[PDB]
């Protein structure tokens, strides 16, 4: 994006129970970390997976049921296999170094 340092797609997705769906989070900073949360309904972040670097993926609290891939220094996907219904949320991915945390603007997904 023309204004953001971290930048979040699709910003929406729907899908079929059953379908993989993947989330692209991009940073064009150069930030080492990146991080998956999935937000609750009081607006808590949980975290899924997060990564320090190109190559490294590390599990959160909420893992079950999502993977993660840091192909680039750019990229962190999250990955769901198999979507479900109890992954209809929103989810937010963020970036940084140090205790620094950049965050994408949120995908809405509906697992239908």
Not at 17 to 40: A, F, I, P
Request: charged letters at 15%; one cysteine or more.
């Amino acid at each position: 994006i023309l204004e953001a340092a971290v930048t979040q797609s699709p910003r929406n997705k729907v899908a079929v129970t059953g379908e993989k769906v993947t989330l692209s989070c991009q940073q064009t900073n150069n930030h080492n970390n990146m991080y998956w949360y999935r937000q609750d309904t009081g607006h808590g972040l949980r975290l899924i997976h997060y990564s320090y670097g190109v190559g490294n993926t590390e599990k959160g609290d909420i893992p079950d049921g999502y993977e993660a891939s840091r192909p680039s220094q750019e990229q962190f996907s999250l990955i769901l296999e198999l979507a479900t219904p109890s992954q209809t949320t929103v989810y937010f991915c963020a970036s940084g170094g140090g205790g620094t945390l950049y965050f994408g603007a949120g995908t809405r997904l509906s697992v239908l």
